[PDB]
Amino acid sequence: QAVDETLTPWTWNNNNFSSLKITGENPGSFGLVRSQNDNLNISSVTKNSSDDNLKYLNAVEKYLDGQQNFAIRRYDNNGRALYDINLAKMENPSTVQRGLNGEPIFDPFKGFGLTGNAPTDWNEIKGKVPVEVVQSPHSPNLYFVLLVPKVALEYHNLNNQVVKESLEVKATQSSFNPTQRLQKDSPVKDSSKQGEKLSETTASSMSSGMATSTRAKALKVEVERGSQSDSLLKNDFAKKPLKHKNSSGEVKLEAEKEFTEAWKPLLTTDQIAREKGMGATVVSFYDAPYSENHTAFGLVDHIDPKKMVENYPPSWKTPKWNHHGIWDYNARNLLLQTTGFFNPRRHPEWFDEGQAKADNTSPGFKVGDTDHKKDGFKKNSSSPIALPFEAYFANIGNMVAIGNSVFIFGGNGHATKMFTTNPLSIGVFRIKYTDNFSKSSVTGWPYAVLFGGLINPQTNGLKDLPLGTNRWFEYVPRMAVSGVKWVGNQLVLAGTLTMGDTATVPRLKYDQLEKHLNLVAQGQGLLREDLQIFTPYGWANRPDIPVGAWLQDEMGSKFGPHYFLNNPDIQDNVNNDTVEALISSYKNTDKLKHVYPYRYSGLYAWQLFNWSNKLTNTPLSANFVNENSYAPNSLFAAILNEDLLTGLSDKIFYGKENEFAENEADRFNQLLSLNPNPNTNWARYLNVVQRFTTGPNLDSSTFDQFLDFLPWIGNGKPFSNSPSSSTPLPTFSNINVGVKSMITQHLNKENTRWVFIPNFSPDIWTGAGYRVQSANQKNGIPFEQVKPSNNSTPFDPNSDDNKVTPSGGSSKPTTYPALPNSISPTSDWINALTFTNKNNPQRNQLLLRSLLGTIPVLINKSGDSNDQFNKDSEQKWDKTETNEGNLPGFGEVNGLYNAALLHTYGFFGTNTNSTDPKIGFKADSSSSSSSTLVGSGLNWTSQDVGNLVVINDTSFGFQLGGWFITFTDFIRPRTGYLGITLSSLQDQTIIWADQPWTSFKGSYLDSDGTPKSLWDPTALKSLPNSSTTYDTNPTLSPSFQLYQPNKVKAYQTTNTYNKLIEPVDATSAATNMTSLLKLLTTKNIKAKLGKGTASSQGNNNGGGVSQTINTITTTGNISEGLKEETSIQAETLKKFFDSKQNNKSEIGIGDSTFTKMDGKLTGVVSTPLVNLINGQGATSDSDTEKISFKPGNQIDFNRLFTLPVTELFDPNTMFVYDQYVPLLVNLPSGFDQASIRLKVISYSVENQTLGVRLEFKDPQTQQFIPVLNASSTGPQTVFQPFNQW
């Protein structure tokens, strides 16, 4: 029961909790502790063939019960160990004897009463490990401790064959090729189903719509219930004229023939619930350090995953589907993009059967029927969203106690985060206690139903982000939770959050999947990449056009108005005549909707604005949710509603409104908002989030301007490269990039001299990759981007097809005269949302992944001999319009400039290496070009988030990858402050490590007031093996992604980017780019850069601690850089930052101060007075050495106890009167007796005894604290008049 000297403090990877700062009556720390012993040969247990995972894990737990020891030892206010609480060695533990009212009988000196019998489930809970301890805010001496199995600690060390990766390196006997596991072949017209294509309107109803268009008429989409049981009289949305290509079998998604070694969890959710010994459990136990019966347990409650799954929205029983239903399901299935809103093809973690259900087959609705009228009926489903082992144990961590209920918000998922899989916390577990912590109820709710109330007016940061949902919770937010803590009076949840997918929002045309391999993979789930890849050539004019309208123009000569290669240059006007003739004329009824002839088409920003779950000023208003990000692609900190969370009922009740439409007849007129059923309570959960933020309080191009300001941890140089004619250009921002152009000459060339730009001259920097007739005509480009289908002549405006006849027949062209001067991936246009490419959803992911330092780069030429990219004589920043600028314009990460990004990385030039790596992208003009995206060389992952440390009443922060990020201005934002302070890590070994996050050993707030993070550069976990014994071309790493090849036609010498850069079939290009594919593995990139091995050098062991930069009131002030008097906001911010490149400190960017500490770092134990690293360095309470109790023989009992115990103290406050204190406590001469008080805690008139606990005014912290040296026994003593017996 006493302190164990062989157990050292530690910290769990999932929550990084090491100690709980107990405050109040008995201040101290509940530090975790473990057996540091190595020699744990987990391979000693043999995993046989027929033995199942459950039996194997039971054997592993039995084995670890002997070789491992864990406990939660309590420390005094001075950091001195008191007792251990080794749950596996506590003999005859007993629950607390309770009264009828539920109060635990407690006498301060006799302690807690014991019933003598073990708490519930003790046999199956004794072996579990503690990972977290949380105090109650109200009930004294009451604690909860979170218990998990030892497997969840040893998960990574388990044998690979039972802990597999979603991607397989294979033996590579046939050379590496990233497209091998990708289905790529395109669908082809069905020659047996041609006649069921959507019918063009027989005659457009004029209905006084005088405007007349010779163009092709709209297609009819008629759906009506009819009366047939399982079929519809009309099912136009189901028209299915396409089919998969038949080559060596049908090319479609099917787990059986693809995922032979399918990824599957360790334990299904039902098995977690049933097997009590494998799930997390929290036991409420009472602790008293100075009492005889110091500790005793209360209730034991398993965190039942079924009590969580039962609160999933019903829409999540059928993830393959969505409120759109048949039409989008068909579109995705033919495009080889996996269907639904949360698909195991993209998120296999959350499904009991894992990848074995990873396809669109059996989607829960009838599909693929020989008769299209039959398709679209609800049927049996088999693959609902669940909570298997990995997601579950990502969801256990970061407890918080509120009122009579305790919440588990989950952790960052590193407990079970492998290289190619990303478990996260999907919702909030709650345990509610009744009748004063006597009985309890366990339940959980998903984050989706909690975050539905997000609306743009809340956040001060980026707008229109993909964080919205709707009456069907098809948006599945999950968090890698940094932690939950009270920042002052406001409860804060913080960490990283997965937006709705924004990469796959555009769709390819049905014949352009062989030349957009990166995008088709992103949609396929093979490429678990979240950033938006700029591949705009093959996008359909509209993602949401049913396949029944794809073949209306097969040849493409007419540029089918309803379906054509998306390109804004042929966008229709918005004139009243144009819309009246084209769109408004075809009035739609309850049983008829039209695919309008209006040539809808726009770039990435327009695509997202129309077809992403962007936030809106009202909740549940996101009609278009495509998918959910793979990894957390956005920082997120939200102020939660404490009272509402306490008050919500345990069990949720959805209804027909949340269900999907039963059949297409009801789906067609499916409203977005329906009155909730009277007896349902799902809506009540929507308003938990009081506020939220994702980054600095900046919007639009200001955000990208800041992104330029933040530096790259890999080498420290800014992404802008501003501090020095062919000089390097910034990557994100466009200011001083390219040439200024006047937006008043774009599109209609009307009413824009003062609407977009308050300045008198509305000149906008077109950025890199801009198109211009000539320097003399840089402002606006005329219609010379004519789109020819074949080589057959320009797009031919002024044609009868592309003209509209208003009232009277005064025909005119419907296409704009002049167009914006850029469609580059870095193209920004406040004046044309249809042409602009930079978007807030991209900007958030760019901030997160720039902080992480793993932004991919397009590469044409590796460092190999005869394949070298020369910085000099081959890169010309002054000629970004021409191929000499090397801007790919296809495959690049949207919103950034590939050459600038590479220069920052140093892939070419001596920026990162002493000698030029000669790695770069060349826009070849003499032949075809092939390219591939490769990682940054760093292996930080977005889930790398540490402790949530509260700095003060208004600011909080946490470690993020190699950065420490503090949300200075979230609780109480101040105008003009960016509201973020960033502190980079200085250790090169950690920055460039293969698995750096294994080195982070927790963060905490130091007494001096500056947060700090532990670092153990000797704790890095290398990759599982040295590639066995052969060269493994694909080597998995947390940042590794199967970036598919991209092949692009020769770049024009002149007017390179007038049109979209056309690609060609790149399926066979893999074998001709081995020297580039080899750069996919991060080790090879590091070797090229020189960071491959210990060659990084520097500190050899270098164990120490890093501290965030010192901050002041003026820190983070960019009010000068904000605001507008003579420029645009982005340009003035660029000027401001440029003027402060040598003073990044005052803007909140700097290198974290780091100090060396000898020996291993395993964790901290923090108590409100001081913080002990590894629990070393306890003191003797110097400030109260001369305060102690007078022993009994030195006290005259008659002098004191002649008066009664009642009037020796104040019963109304239980305080010993000041005049008598010196009579009992020894003090040095001249000591201020008023600074020390006695807190009576027990008395008995019948025995005239007095139990007293001492307190002392701490000069350091202005709070009364107990004196631990007051007696050999501690700060509590019993005074009686010689009647102790």
CA distance 856 to 841: 17
Q: 1215 to each of 26, 477, 1242, how far by Cα in Å?
A: 17, 52, 11
Q: Per the structure block, which two tokens stand in for 666?
A: 């009801």
CA distance 770 to 1055: 9
Q: Per the structure block, which two tokens stand in for 560?
A: 């089918």
Q: Report the candidate in 347, 345, 337, 332 with the shortest Cα–Cα distance to residue 259.
A: 345
Residues in CB range of 751: below 8 A, 6 or more apart: none
Residues in CB range of 307: below 8 A, 6 or more apart: 442, 443, 444
Number of Cβ within 10 Å of residue 1206's Cβ equals 10
Question: Which residues, listed in sequence order, are joined to residue 430 by a DSSP beta bridge?
Answer: 407, 443
Question: Is residue 1275 within 8 Å of residue 1267, measured between CB atoms?
Answer: yes
Q: Report the candidate in 609, 629, 687, 412 with the shortest Cα–Cα distance to residue 499.
A: 629
* Phi, psi (degrees; rounded to nearest 5) at 1183: -70, -10
* CB contact burial 904-925 (16+ within 10 A = b; e otherwise): bbbbbbebbbeebbbbbbbbbe
Number of Cβ within 10 Å of residue 756's Cβ equals 17
Residues in CB range of 477: below 8 A, 6 or more apart: 447, 448, 451, 467, 469, 497, 498, 499, 628
Q: Where are the alpha helices (DSSP H) in 289-352?
A: 306-309, 326-335
Strands in 1122-1268 per DSSP E:
1149-1151, 1153-1156, 1164-1166, 1171-1173, 1188-1189, 1209-1210, 1215-1216, 1225-1226, 1236-1244, 1249-1257, 1264-1265
Using the structure block, give the residue that is written with the tokens 């090229």. 1088
Q: Report the candidate in 623, 616, 364 with the shortest Cα–Cα distance to residue 471.
A: 623
Q: Per the structure block, which two tokens stand in for 92?
A: 């005859």
Q: 609 to each of 174, 422, 461, 693, how far by Cα in Å?
A: 44, 28, 17, 20
Strands in 327-434 per DSSP E:
399-402, 405-408, 427-434
Q: Per the structure block, which two tokens stand in for 793?
A: 């002549």
**Interstrand relation of 963-967 and 981-984 (parallel, antiparallel or unpaired):** antiparallel
Cα 1025–1028–1034 angle (5° rounding)?
80
- Output DSSP code: residue 864: S
CA distance 95 to 119: 5
Residues in CB range of 56: below 8 A, 6 or more apart: 45, 47, 162
CA distance 976 to 697: 8
Q: What is the dihedral of CA 1032, 1033, 1035, 1041, to 10 degrees?
A: -160
Question: Is residue 877 within 8 Å of residue 728, measured between CB atoms?
Answer: yes
DSSP of 670-726: --S--PPPTT--GGGGGG-EEEEE-SSS--THHHHHHHHHSBPTTT--BSS------
Our measurement of the distance from residue 758's CA atom to the centroid of its chain's CA atoms, rounded to an integer in Å, reads: 36
DSSP of 569-596: GG-B---HHHHIIIIITS--BTTBEEE-
Q: Is 270 helix (H, G, I), strand (E, B) or coil?
A: helix
* CB contact burial 37-58 (16+ within 10 A = b; e otherwise): eeeeeeeebeeeeeeebeebbb
Number of Cβ within 10 Å of residue 894's Cβ equals 26
CA distance 60 to 150: 9
Question: Is residue 547 within 8 Å of residue 328, measured between CB atoms?
Answer: no
CA distance 457 to 462: 11
Amino acid at 377: F
Our measurement of the distance from residue 346's CA atom to the centroid of its chain's CA atoms, rounded to an integer in Å, reads: 15
Q: Is 1250 helix (H, G, I), strand (E, B) or coil?
A: strand
Using the structure block, give the residue that is written with the tokens 């579990």. 128
CA pseudo-torsion sign 1156, 1159, 1165, 1168: negative
* Phi, psi (degrees; rounded to nearest 5) at 473: -80, 55
Q: Where are the alpha helices (DSSP H) in 75-193?
A: 122-125, 151-154
Residues in CB range of 840: below 8 A, 6 or more apart: 462, 463, 464, 465, 699, 703
Burial of 482 (0-12, 13-18, 19+ CB in 10 A): buried
Question: Which residues, listed in sequence order, are joined to residue 200 by a DSSP beta bridge?
Answer: 219
**Interstrand relation of 1149-1151 and 981-984 (parallel, antiparallel or unpaired):** parallel
Using the structure block, give the residue that is written with the tokens 């093979």. 526
Residues in CB range of 1281: below 8 A, 6 or more apart: 1197, 1198, 1200, 1201, 1248
Q: 241 to each of 244, 465, 841, how far by Cα in Å?
A: 11, 35, 34
CA distance 502 to 625: 9
End-to-end CA distance of the chain: 27
Question: Which residues, listed in sequence order, are joined to residue 933 by a DSSP beta bridge?
Answer: 858
Our measurement of the distance from residue 534's CA atom to the centroid of its chain's CA atoms, rounded to an integer in Å, reads: 22
* CB contact burial 497-516 (16+ within 10 A = b; e otherwise): bbbbbbbbbbbbbbbbbbbb
Q: Per the structure block, which two tokens stand in for 81?
A: 């160990």
Our measurement of the distance from residue 179's CA atom to the centroid of its chain's CA atoms, rounded to an integer in Å, reads: 27
CA distance 385 to 310: 11
CA distance 105 to 504: 61
Q: Is 643 helix (H, G, I), strand (E, B) or coil?
A: helix
CA pseudo-torsion sign 272, 276, 278, 282: positive
CA distance 64 to 41: 10
Burial of 1009 (0-12, 13-18, 19+ CB in 10 A): exposed
Q: Is 147 helix (H, G, I), strand (E, B) or coil?
A: strand
Using the structure block, give the residue that is written with the tokens 């008023």. 1234
Q: Report the candidate in 659, 305, 638 with the shortest Cα–Cα distance to residue 494.
A: 638
CA pseudo-torsion sign 377, 382, 386, 391: negative
Our measurement of the distance from residue 677's CA atom to the centroid of its chain's CA atoms, rounded to an integer in Å, reads: 33
Q: 965 to each of 12, 234, 713, 913, 947, how far by Cα in Å?
A: 21, 56, 14, 28, 11
Q: Per the structure block, which two tokens stand in for 976?
A: 């003009």
Give the technique used to solve this structure: cryo-EM
CA distance 298 to 287: 11
Question: Is residue 804 within 8 Å of residue 211, measured between CB atoms?
Answer: yes
